[PDB]
From a paper:
[name] is a phospholipase anchored to membranes via two palmitoylated cysteines located in a hydrophobic membrane-interacting region (MIR). We showed that [name] forms a homodimer on membranes, and tecovirimat inserts into a cavity formed between the two protomers.
We obtained cubic crystals of sF13A295E and soaked them in tecovirimat. In the absence of tecovirimat, sF13A295E formed a homodimer that resembled that of sF13WT, but with the ends of the α10 helix being more open, so that Y285 was hydrogen-bonded with Q299 instead of with N300, as in the wild-type protein. In line with the AUC experiments, tecovirimat induced a strong increase in the PLA signal in cells expressing Flag–F13WT, a slight increase in cells expressing Flag–F13A295E and none in cells expressing Flag–F134MUT.
Residue numbers in the entry: 6 to 372
The structure:
């Protein structure tokens, strides 16, 4: 028999200067458990890589340095745009194998956002706490940890597809025949979850034929929302700016409005503050302002460094990820998202969203 929730528990970062309190596992505690219980390997992936920026980040890096010195294979995948701190990292840990990744060499837009850990094919973390000293200590984050081996192995297979896009000689990032020979597999998806948990992936050109696109899964859950939509992402402005041009993409932005106007879903949105100089953010703000007064919508903003990417639907489905609901992310970027329908796991997620919705850092949207 399989366990309910796949042995999953919540993990997050609550800085001391912030009023967030919870009994769940902390991000700093989580990484020590992974490194201490590690016996075979430790695979880590994120965009930036800068652990020494805080005290708690430097302690995990020292525990990982000790791990690489005892015979544990340590491989760290970072996007080639976080290559500044590379010489600093290898200078402190020579035994850790750092690898620069460029998943999109066709247009150089897709970035590596896959923010997760995996060790011994038994334990694993996933969330929005990137391998930075801030995301462990000073930046509020949110993730999930599970010591269920079958779940960690299906997350290891996500790591295998990403490692192939290394910038060294002929590989999946250089050759097209070596990129087509990738066993891009997945053990569980929306049509066959494990213990009520499954993974969704991104972008579309890295799914193969078995994996699920996170874009289609999120929109389907938003269009199938009957009661409540609770989102805590950085921003949901349908327009992003790639290079010196703007990219309009309102797929997630419209499916939410379709819920609050046609279906009358009580929707609460907790996004970060925006720039007054950005006409795209201001026009998006003045639009949402007219809906909280007309339909059952509510919007609050925050100014703190927060990477949280949470989506709760009808107290029946929870979606934690590292990418933000926008066009640039769900079209080119590569990451892995957490999906679970376990009522007890979604309940603990609703417990967190309510906490942040009433926190002092969440002031009401004023225009
Ligand atoms: O979302 C609406 N408009 N809107 C966009 O289409 C975006 C584009 C244009 C302006 C900004 C950004 C540059 C991108 C965004 C924005 O606010 C909107 C939704 C519902 C209503 C109604 F109130 F009738 F319910 C009216 C309008």
């Amino acid at each position: 028999s399989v366990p309910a929730g796949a042995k999953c528990r919540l993990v997050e970062t609550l800085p001391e200067n912030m009023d967030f309190r919870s009994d769940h596992l902390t991000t700093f505690e989580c990484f020590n458990e992974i490194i201490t219980l590690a016996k075979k390997y430790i695979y880590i992936a994120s965009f930036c890589c800068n652990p020494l920026s805080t005290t708690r980040g430097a302690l995990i890096f020292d525990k990982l340095k000790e791990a690489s010195e005892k015979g544990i294979k340590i491989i760290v995948l970072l996007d080639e745009r976080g290559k500044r701190n590379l010489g600093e990292l290898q200078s402190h840990c020579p035994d850790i194998n750092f690898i620069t990744v460029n998943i999109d060499k066709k247009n150089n837009v897709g970035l590596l956002l896959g923010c997760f850990w995996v060790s011994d094919d038994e334990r694993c973390y996933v969330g929005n706490a990137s391998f930075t000293g801030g995301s462990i200590h000073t930046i509020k984050t949110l993730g999930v940890y599970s010591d269920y081996p079958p779940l960690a192995t299906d997350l290891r297979r996500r790591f295998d597809t990403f490692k192939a896009f290394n910038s060294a000689k002929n590989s999946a990032a250089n050759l097209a025949s070596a990129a087509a020979a990738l066993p891009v597999s997945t053990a569980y998806h929306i049509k066959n979850p494990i213990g009520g948990v499954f993974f969704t992936d991104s972008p579309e050109h890295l799914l193969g034929y078995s994996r699920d696109l996170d874009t289609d899964v999120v929109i389907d859950k938003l269009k199938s929302a009957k009661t409540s939509i609770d989102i805590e992402h950085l921003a949901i402005v349908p327009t992003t700016r790639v290079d010196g041009n703007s990219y309009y993409w309102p797929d997630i932005y419209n499916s939410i409005i379709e819920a609050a106007i046609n279906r009358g879903v009580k929707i609460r949105l907790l996004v970060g503050n925006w720039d007054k100089n950005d006409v795209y953010s201001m026009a998006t703000a003045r639009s949402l302002d007219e809906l909280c007064v007309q339909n059952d919508l509510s919007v609050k903003v925050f100014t703190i460094q927060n990477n949280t990417k949470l989506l709760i639907v009808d107290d029946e489905y929870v979606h934690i990820t590292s990418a933000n609901f926008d066009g640039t992310h769900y079209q080119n970027h590569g990451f892995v998202s957490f999906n679970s329908i376990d009522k007890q796991l979604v309940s603990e997620a609703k417990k967190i969203f309510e906490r942040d919705w009433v926190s002092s850092h969440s002031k009401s949207l004023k225009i």
